[PDB]
Amino acid sequence: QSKPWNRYRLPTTLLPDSYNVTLRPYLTPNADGLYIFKGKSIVRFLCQEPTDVIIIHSKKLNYTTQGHMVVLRGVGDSQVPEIDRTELVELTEYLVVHLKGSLQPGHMYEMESEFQGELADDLAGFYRSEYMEGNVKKVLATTQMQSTDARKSFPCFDEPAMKATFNITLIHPNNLTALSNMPPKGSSTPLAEDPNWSVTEFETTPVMSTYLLAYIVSEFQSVNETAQNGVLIRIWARPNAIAEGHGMYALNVTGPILNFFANHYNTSYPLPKSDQIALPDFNAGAMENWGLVTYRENALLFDPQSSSISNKERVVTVIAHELAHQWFGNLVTLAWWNDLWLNEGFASYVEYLGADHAEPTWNLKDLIVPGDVYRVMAVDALASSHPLTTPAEEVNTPAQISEMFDSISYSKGASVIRMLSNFLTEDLFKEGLASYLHAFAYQNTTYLDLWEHLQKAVDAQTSIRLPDTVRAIMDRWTLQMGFPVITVDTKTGNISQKHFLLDSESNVTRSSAFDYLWIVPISSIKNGVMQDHYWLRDVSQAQNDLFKTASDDWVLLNVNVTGYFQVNYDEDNWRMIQHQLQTNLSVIPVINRAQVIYDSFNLATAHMVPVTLALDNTLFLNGEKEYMPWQAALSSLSYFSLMFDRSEVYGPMKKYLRKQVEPLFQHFETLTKNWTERPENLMDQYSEINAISTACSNGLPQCENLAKTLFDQWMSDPENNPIHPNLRSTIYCNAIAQGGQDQWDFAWGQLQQAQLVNEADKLRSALACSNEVWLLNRYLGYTLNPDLIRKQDATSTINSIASNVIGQPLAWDFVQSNWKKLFQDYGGGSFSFSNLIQGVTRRFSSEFELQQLEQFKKNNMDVGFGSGTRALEQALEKTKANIKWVKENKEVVLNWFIEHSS
Ligand SMILES: *[C@@H]1O[C@H](CO)[C@@H](O[C@@H]2O[C@H](CO)[C@@H](O[C@@H]3O[C@H](CO)[C@@H](O)[C@H](O)[C@H]3NC(C)=O)[C@H](O)[C@H]2NC(C)=O)[C@H](O)[C@H]1NC(C)=O
Ligand SMILES: *[C@@H]1O[C@H](CO)[C@@H](O[C@@H]2O[C@H](CO)[C@@H](O[C@@H]3O[C@H](CO)[C@@H](O)[C@H](O)[C@H]3NC(C)=O)[C@H](O)[C@H]2NC(C)=O)[C@H](O)[C@H]1NC(C)=O
Ligand SMILES: *[C@@H]1O[C@H](CO)[C@@H](O[C@@H]2O[C@H](CO)[C@@H](O[C@@H]3O[C@H](CO)[C@@H](O)[C@H](O)[C@H]3NC(C)=O)[C@H](O)[C@H]2NC(C)=O)[C@H](O)[C@H]1NC(C)=O
Ligand SMILES: *[C@@H]1O[C@H](CO)[C@@H](O[C@@H]2O[C@H](CO)[C@@H](O)[C@H](O)[C@H]2NC(C)=O)[C@H](O)[C@H]1NC(C)=O
Ligand SMILES: *[C@@H]1O[C@H](CO)[C@@H](O[C@@H]2O[C@H](CO)[C@@H](O)[C@H](O)[C@H]2NC(C)=O)[C@H](O)[C@H]1NC(C)=O
Ligand SMILES: *[C@@H]1O[C@H](CO)[C@@H](O[C@@H]2O[C@H](CO)[C@@H](O)[C@H](O)[C@H]2NC(C)=O)[C@H](O)[C@H]1NC(C)=O
Ligand SMILES: *[C@@H]1O[C@H](CO)[C@@H](O[C@@H]2O[C@H](CO)[C@@H](O)[C@H](O)[C@H]2NC(C)=O)[C@H](O)[C@H]1NC(C)=O
Ligand SMILES: *[C@@H]1O[C@H](CO)[C@@H](O[C@@H]2O[C@H](CO)[C@@H](O)[C@H](O)[C@H]2NC(C)=O)[C@H](O)[C@H]1NC(C)=O
Ligand SMILES: *[C@@H]1O[C@H](CO)[C@@H](O[C@@H]2O[C@H](CO)[C@@H](O)[C@H](O)[C@H]2NC(C)=O)[C@H](O)[C@H]1NC(C)=O
Ligand SMILES: *[C@@H]1O[C@H](CO)[C@@H](O)[C@H](O)[C@H]1NC(C)=O
Ligand SMILES: *[C@@H]1O[C@H](CO)[C@@H](O)[C@H](O)[C@H]1NC(C)=O
Ligand SMILES: [Zn+2]
């Protein structure tokens, strides 16, 4: 038999009841420059099955406990066995307490320890974060337990189902504020041994998972609101950020969001208070710690004076996402990491619902389609994809756990759950969801538990009828990878499904229990009129008159793309759809106007329609005012720009896009009153942003003029920037492009003195738009100077230069030549050679450029490629694919653009 301390999963012989944890960060280094934290903990646990060994998680902790690493006591009048020895097993991250006798079933024990670890700047466990206020480097102490890092802060049974209550105490400098999951018990008191420190105890948590604990010591201040029901709401940030009002939007939306979810979940917010904190350079983005959610600054803070509308959208949705978890994930927790998709998928879906409550005019629910659905289909339409579900017994190590957090989990998770809610109807979905939350509150679940509760709700009504059980249906979408293309022959109404792969030559080797057949919910509209709903059963082919048309009619499947699939038609039907969009576009829902474009380009890639059919699907856009369909086109064509923008194809492409976008440009010119005032709602602001971007980058003289006027204006009065934050990135870029070193030097100055990251980002990126070789090269010369360009921004800046058709050869030469600086930057901070390689080689699409990539690889003898080693092979393989796609497409595409550019 194997020794349990060499297994990655904990025994089930002992379960925790409750913990006391006292942590003390030392925010002053020890002289060799080491930061530490000290801790003391007691865990009370119950013996379920007799055992002579206590196995608990511990990671990078030194123990200073008197005697062995722990002291062990009986609770009440329980006797305790003597300890034989305590040992640390690093691989499985265990503290192992060998006893001289056995613990007894039904008895409770208390295990006490004293310990310390590094308070490292490593964003893991209890860690430090350094940042600037004026001339002073500030250091705060914060946490990130997700997923398996609670054990790095104190010894604990560190699996999500082993829930317990926690009594947290922080010992901290007396002028700093201490925060945790729960409110403080009362006022802090001086530490007797050194009154320069204070002691803050927090109220007992509810029964909860280790990965959701948080505790923070900082100088941060807050804005506050007390909801009607007494729930205290705070936004925490740097003193200067709070003073500038940058927390106000977050504060504005939080209350409405929490209220939405309490109703949505039919369950009261389970905590006395809600803290949200903006952390500078929090690389994890956001973390849903129960009652103390952490965010990176740019995710939580908003500056009205400098920030675009998309910045506002990012804030409200990120908040909605993390707050969703305060019920789904935190109150009811998935028993194991193999089910992470359900948790993350669920939040990734309802983030739109919660945000929609806060901003009900913005139509935010739509954004899941571009943002998650089409995003994840790009990777789920590969042979190298994977099922949402993973057997629990395959997910053991901290590395395997981390692999759970990917695109499939979040975005497909969101997509399939949204499909589910839609085919059940939302009211039914909510009833099952409430039932599930009430049944399992403060406990753990698998996805089968959710299915079971949804089934209960289905079985309790008569109106919604399904072709099979909730499980059986969802099994098709969760146990196998990928998704079907549904193809309709409208002459007969024959309808088929096959596993959709972008690469029509690809070999799938992952087998499916279902032979890649799905049970598919199919909505459809015929001549602008909703039809009866239809289910494709697990068959390759079927027939229904729902999908059979006359010659003047059209049909269109998957209304609003609720279903996780793409749709192809016979050419006649495609043409009727096209005719419709050409003559009265408003007959077809805006999301579907986008879909037509998204799907057909994917179908063209897969060789299932000709590419010209996809391009025909953009012809209607000259009368399209709305954001989404235009965004579908821009996303689908960016590859065409990337392949062709150095070729004869490019002039007719530009000309075609100029023709298409001119009327939209004109529309907004009037609507915005000569560009003085933005459109009202989000979608229209977005459409305007894209229209100006598209107009300018394609050389519409009117947009070019606008950019010069505004940038000249700004330059004549630097302190009063006349350019609305929504339009900044285009106007900066186009105007630098048009100009010389005057514009360039001016924007360089602004960059150097910018206080706000986002504005710095815009400037950095616009500077790459110059059409002077000498400026781009000089600029390249700065990117490795950490005085002029932050290191974490160097490869980004190089990529932006590479993106400039003129800066392509300059960047490539620069990367080649200074590659001999992996050995400055695999050592001194990561660097992401991987993203740099992809960026600078993205364009490569000929034999000659392939020969160059090869010849550059012949610098294998030493230096190698570091974290970009795999990227470089991807590059050579992507280039081969580009070579092949350009030979197949260049002629057909050139002539289509010539033909349609007037
Ligand atoms: C986990 O932390 C809890 C909070 O520190 C502990 O509970 C507290 O124990 C204290 C003493 O052990 C009690 O404080 C006072 O101490 C005096 C000492 O002279 C005692 O007489 C008193 O009982 C007590 N105060 C009063 C008003 O009587 C606290 O009563 C108590 N706090 C609580 C219960 O909220 C837990 O003991 C500790 N857990 C373990 C396993 O050690
Ligand atoms: C947890 O305990 C670890 C093992 O006891 C500590 O790791 C040791 O850190 C020492 C530095 O504190 C290093 O030893 C020497 O330190 C002296 C002065 O600090 C220096 O003169 C030497 O350069 C250094 N010796 C060497 C060979 O570098 C040890 O490197 C290191 N030992 C091991 C086995 O890793 C941790 O510091 C300690 N952590 C905490 C938070 O308490
Ligand atoms: C958090 O919510 C607050 C309350 O809803 C918002 O406060 C609103 O700020 C608006 C922008 O500053 C103000 O709108 C207009 O500002 C112009 C500029 O001077 C004035 O001419 C207008 O008179 C004024 N509004 C009106 C209706 O005349 C609002 O005054 C103000 N609304 C309220 C109710 O106080 C915050 O904007 C919001 N914070 C963020 C970051 O979104
Ligand atoms: C954490 O604090 C809580 C709340 O004070 C402690 O809960 C008490 O537990 C004791 C001993 O089990 C019971 O007698 C009390 O009735 C509990 N009080 C409440 C309000 O539940 C809990 O024991 C503490 N945890 C640890 C490990 O000491
Ligand atoms: C908390 O107290 C510490 C110690 O007095 C203050 O930290 C000093 O701040 C000054 C600037 O005012 C620096 O020049 C010192 O080097 C700091 N010392 C240390 C160890 O950081 C700190 O400013 C106080 N913070 C608050 C919010 O009151
Ligand atoms: C959970 O939902 C139930 C059902 O809507 C709520 O209870 C209903 O509340 C309405 C509101 O006036 C009453 O008229 C109904 O008679 C109630 N139905 C039942 C079965 O009691 C309940 O308020 C919700 N709970 C939470 C915490 O949101
Ligand atoms: C994981 O969650 C399950 C429920 O999904 C917990 O099992 C329940 O425990 C409660 C309260 O102690 C009992 O009332 C139920 O009868 C149990 N349901 C079961 C066993 O199916 C289980 O305790 C949780 N696991 C851990 C380690 O806490
Ligand atoms: C639509 O589907 C039907 C089958 O369900 C196809 O009709 C069959 O054609 C085969 C040709 O070998 C005949 O042997 C069968 O007897 C036909 N079944 C009938 C007529 O009911 C038809 O070809 C399909 N048409 C499409 C996909 O355009
Ligand atoms: C398709 O999505 C659109 C939104 O893009 C839905 O239109 C919404 O309809 C509801 C009910 O009338 C209204 O609350 C919203 O005002 C509508 N928004 C807009 C922008 O029109 C439409 O309901 C969806 N269609 C289907 C069949 O689900
Ligand atoms: C897939 O197997 C086929 C055999 O039909 C082979 O021709 C092809 O090269 C293989 N690999 C790819 C990526 O197409
Ligand atoms: C276009 O269709 C919409 C929705 O069916 C309708 O209300 C509108 O009258 C139509 N417009 C024209 C110009 O026919
Ligand atoms: Zn999440």
mmCIF file with all atom_site columns, N, CA and C and ligand atoms in Angstrom, residues 360 363 365-366 418 422 523 525 530 559-560 562 589-592 626 628, ligand 9:
data_model
loop_
_atom_site.group_PDB
_atom_site.id
_atom_site.type_symbol
_atom_site.label_atom_id
_atom_site.label_alt_id
_atom_site.label_comp_id
_atom_site.label_asym_id
_atom_site.label_entity_id
_atom_site.label_seq_id
_atom_site.pdbx_PDB_ins_code
_atom_site.Cartn_x
_atom_site.Cartn_y
_atom_site.Cartn_z
_atom_site.occupancy
_atom_site.B_iso_or_equiv
_atom_site.pdbx_formal_charge
_atom_site.auth_seq_id
_atom_site.auth_comp_id
_atom_site.auth_asym_id
_atom_site.auth_atom_id
_atom_site.pdbx_PDB_model_num
ATOM   1  N N   . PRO A 1 360 ? -29.067 49.263 -17.037 1.00 0.00 ? 360 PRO A N   1
ATOM   2  C CA  . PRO A 1 360 ? -30.134 48.625 -17.810 1.00 0.00 ? 360 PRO A CA  1
ATOM   3  C C   . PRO A 1 360 ? -30.352 49.182 -19.243 1.00 0.00 ? 360 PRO A C   1
ATOM   4  N N   . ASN A 1 363 ? -27.733 47.335 -22.775 1.00 0.00 ? 363 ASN A N   1
ATOM   5  C CA  . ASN A 1 363 ? -27.824 46.077 -23.484 1.00 0.00 ? 363 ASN A CA  1
ATOM   6  C C   . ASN A 1 363 ? -26.648 45.099 -23.290 1.00 0.00 ? 363 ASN A C   1
ATOM   7  N N   . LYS A 1 365 ? -26.204 42.256 -21.874 1.00 0.00 ? 365 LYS A N   1
ATOM   8  C CA  . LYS A 1 365 ? -26.386 40.808 -22.075 1.00 0.00 ? 365 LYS A CA  1
ATOM   9  C C   . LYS A 1 365 ? -25.913 40.342 -23.451 1.00 0.00 ? 365 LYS A C   1
ATOM   10 N N   . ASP A 1 366 ? -25.984 41.221 -24.417 1.00 0.00 ? 366 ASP A N   1
ATOM   11 C CA  . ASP A 1 366 ? -25.576 40.900 -25.781 1.00 0.00 ? 366 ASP A CA  1
ATOM   12 C C   . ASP A 1 366 ? -24.079 40.543 -25.868 1.00 0.00 ? 366 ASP A C   1
ATOM   13 N N   . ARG A 1 418 ? -25.589 29.477 -20.304 1.00 0.00 ? 418 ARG A N   1
ATOM   14 C CA  . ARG A 1 418 ? -26.509 30.377 -20.921 1.00 0.00 ? 418 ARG A CA  1
ATOM   15 C C   . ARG A 1 418 ? -27.521 29.607 -21.863 1.00 0.00 ? 418 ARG A C   1
ATOM   16 N N   . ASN A 1 422 ? -31.642 29.339 -21.233 1.00 0.00 ? 422 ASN A N   1
ATOM   17 C CA  . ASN A 1 422 ? -32.497 29.704 -22.329 1.00 0.00 ? 422 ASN A CA  1
ATOM   18 C C   . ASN A 1 422 ? -33.506 28.599 -22.758 1.00 0.00 ? 422 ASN A C   1
ATOM   19 N N   . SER A 1 523 ? -33.725 27.409 -32.056 1.00 0.00 ? 523 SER A N   1
ATOM   20 C CA  . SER A 1 523 ? -34.700 28.428 -32.342 1.00 0.00 ? 523 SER A CA  1
ATOM   21 C C   . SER A 1 523 ? -34.519 28.892 -33.768 1.00 0.00 ? 523 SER A C   1
ATOM   22 N N   . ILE A 1 525 ? -36.110 31.889 -36.952 1.00 0.00 ? 525 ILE A N   1
ATOM   23 C CA  . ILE A 1 525 ? -36.923 32.994 -37.356 1.00 0.00 ? 525 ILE A CA  1
ATOM   24 C C   . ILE A 1 525 ? -37.154 32.751 -38.865 1.00 0.00 ? 525 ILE A C   1
ATOM   25 N N   . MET A 1 530 ? -40.591 34.735 -35.403 1.00 0.00 ? 530 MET A N   1
ATOM   26 C CA  . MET A 1 530 ? -40.191 33.590 -34.572 1.00 0.00 ? 530 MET A CA  1
ATOM   27 C C   . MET A 1 530 ? -40.972 32.333 -34.936 1.00 0.00 ? 530 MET A C   1
ATOM   28 N N   . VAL A 1 559 ? -31.523 32.001 -32.724 1.00 0.00 ? 559 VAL A N   1
ATOM   29 C CA  . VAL A 1 559 ? -31.848 33.394 -32.537 1.00 0.00 ? 559 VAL A CA  1
ATOM   30 C C   . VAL A 1 559 ? -30.993 33.917 -31.383 1.00 0.00 ? 559 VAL A C   1
ATOM   31 N N   . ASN A 1 560 ? -30.305 35.023 -31.619 1.00 0.00 ? 560 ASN A N   1
ATOM   32 C CA  . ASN A 1 560 ? -29.472 35.624 -30.594 1.00 0.00 ? 560 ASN A CA  1
ATOM   33 C C   . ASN A 1 560 ? -28.302 34.738 -30.154 1.00 0.00 ? 560 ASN A C   1
ATOM   34 N N   . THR A 1 562 ? -28.112 31.866 -28.730 1.00 0.00 ? 562 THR A N   1
ATOM   35 C CA  . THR A 1 562 ? -28.248 31.269 -27.422 1.00 0.00 ? 562 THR A CA  1
ATOM   36 C C   . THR A 1 562 ? -27.629 29.871 -27.395 1.00 0.00 ? 562 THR A C   1
ATOM   37 N N   . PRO A 1 589 ? -32.619 40.272 -35.945 1.00 0.00 ? 589 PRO A N   1
ATOM   38 C CA  . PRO A 1 589 ? -32.064 40.744 -34.684 1.00 0.00 ? 589 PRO A CA  1
ATOM   39 C C   . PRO A 1 589 ? -30.598 41.114 -34.828 1.00 0.00 ? 589 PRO A C   1
ATOM   40 N N   . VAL A 1 590 ? -30.175 42.180 -34.154 1.00 0.00 ? 590 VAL A N   1
ATOM   41 C CA  . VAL A 1 590 ? -28.824 42.663 -34.299 1.00 0.00 ? 590 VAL A CA  1
ATOM   42 C C   . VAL A 1 590 ? -27.753 41.569 -34.005 1.00 0.00 ? 590 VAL A C   1
ATOM   43 N N   . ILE A 1 591 ? -28.007 40.722 -33.034 1.00 0.00 ? 591 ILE A N   1
ATOM   44 C CA  . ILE A 1 591 ? -27.063 39.674 -32.705 1.00 0.00 ? 591 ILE A CA  1
ATOM   45 C C   . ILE A 1 591 ? -26.927 38.743 -33.897 1.00 0.00 ? 591 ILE A C   1
ATOM   46 N N   . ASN A 1 592 ? -28.040 38.466 -34.565 1.00 0.00 ? 592 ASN A N   1
ATOM   47 C CA  . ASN A 1 592 ? -27.989 37.553 -35.715 1.00 0.00 ? 592 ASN A CA  1
ATOM   48 C C   . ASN A 1 592 ? -27.362 38.182 -36.958 1.00 0.00 ? 592 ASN A C   1
ATOM   49 N N   . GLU A 1 626 ? -25.283 49.692 -36.077 1.00 0.00 ? 626 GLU A N   1
ATOM   50 C CA  . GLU A 1 626 ? -25.117 49.108 -34.749 1.00 0.00 ? 626 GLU A CA  1
ATOM   51 C C   . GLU A 1 626 ? -23.752 48.474 -34.552 1.00 0.00 ? 626 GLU A C   1
ATOM   52 N N   . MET A 1 628 ? -22.489 45.567 -33.072 1.00 0.00 ? 628 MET A N   1
ATOM   53 C CA  . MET A 1 628 ? -22.089 44.185 -33.165 1.00 0.00 ? 628 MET A CA  1
ATOM   54 C C   . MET A 1 628 ? -21.733 43.659 -34.562 1.00 0.00 ? 628 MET A C   1
HETATM 55 C C1  . LIG B 2 .   ? -32.773 38.836 -28.925 1.00 0.00 ? 9   LIG B C1  1
HETATM 56 O O1  . LIG B 2 .   ? -31.943 39.799 -28.213 1.00 0.00 ? 9   LIG B O1  1
HETATM 57 C C2  . LIG B 2 .   ? -32.537 41.091 -28.212 1.00 0.00 ? 9   LIG B C2  1
HETATM 58 C C3  . LIG B 2 .   ? -31.544 42.072 -27.617 1.00 0.00 ? 9   LIG B C3  1
HETATM 59 O O2  . LIG B 2 .   ? -30.416 42.283 -28.512 1.00 0.00 ? 9   LIG B O2  1
HETATM 60 C C4  . LIG B 2 .   ? -33.815 41.038 -27.379 1.00 0.00 ? 9   LIG B C4  1
HETATM 61 O O3  . LIG B 2 .   ? -34.427 42.342 -27.474 1.00 0.00 ? 9   LIG B O3  1
HETATM 62 C C5  . LIG B 2 .   ? -34.861 42.755 -26.147 1.00 0.00 ? 9   LIG B C5  1
HETATM 63 O O4  . LIG B 2 .   ? -36.219 42.340 -25.978 1.00 0.00 ? 9   LIG B O4  1
HETATM 64 C C6  . LIG B 2 .   ? -36.661 42.554 -24.569 1.00 0.00 ? 9   LIG B C6  1
HETATM 65 C C7  . LIG B 2 .   ? -38.131 42.160 -24.524 1.00 0.00 ? 9   LIG B C7  1
HETATM 66 O O5  . LIG B 2 .   ? -38.871 43.031 -25.490 1.00 0.00 ? 9   LIG B O5  1
HETATM 67 C C8  . LIG B 2 .   ? -36.507 43.992 -24.146 1.00 0.00 ? 9   LIG B C8  1
HETATM 68 O O6  . LIG B 2 .   ? -36.430 44.046 -22.696 1.00 0.00 ? 9   LIG B O6  1
HETATM 69 C C9  . LIG B 2 .   ? -35.217 44.673 -24.652 1.00 0.00 ? 9   LIG B C9  1
HETATM 70 O O7  . LIG B 2 .   ? -35.490 46.129 -24.671 1.00 0.00 ? 9   LIG B O7  1
HETATM 71 C C10 . LIG B 2 .   ? -34.902 44.245 -26.064 1.00 0.00 ? 9   LIG B C10 1
HETATM 72 N N1  . LIG B 2 .   ? -33.678 44.918 -26.475 1.00 0.00 ? 9   LIG B N1  1
HETATM 73 C C11 . LIG B 2 .   ? -33.564 45.470 -27.703 1.00 0.00 ? 9   LIG B C11 1
HETATM 74 C C12 . LIG B 2 .   ? -32.266 46.169 -27.921 1.00 0.00 ? 9   LIG B C12 1
HETATM 75 O O8  . LIG B 2 .   ? -34.440 45.384 -28.602 1.00 0.00 ? 9   LIG B O8  1
HETATM 76 C C13 . LIG B 2 .   ? -34.783 40.001 -27.936 1.00 0.00 ? 9   LIG B C13 1
HETATM 77 O O9  . LIG B 2 .   ? -35.823 39.768 -26.997 1.00 0.00 ? 9   LIG B O9  1
HETATM 78 C C14 . LIG B 2 .   ? -34.089 38.650 -28.171 1.00 0.00 ? 9   LIG B C14 1
HETATM 79 N N2  . LIG B 2 .   ? -34.950 37.740 -28.914 1.00 0.00 ? 9   LIG B N2  1
HETATM 80 C C15 . LIG B 2 .   ? -35.227 36.511 -28.485 1.00 0.00 ? 9   LIG B C15 1
HETATM 81 C C16 . LIG B 2 .   ? -36.124 35.668 -29.283 1.00 0.00 ? 9   LIG B C16 1
HETATM 82 O O10 . LIG B 2 .   ? -34.774 35.999 -27.460 1.00 0.00 ? 9   LIG B O10 1
#
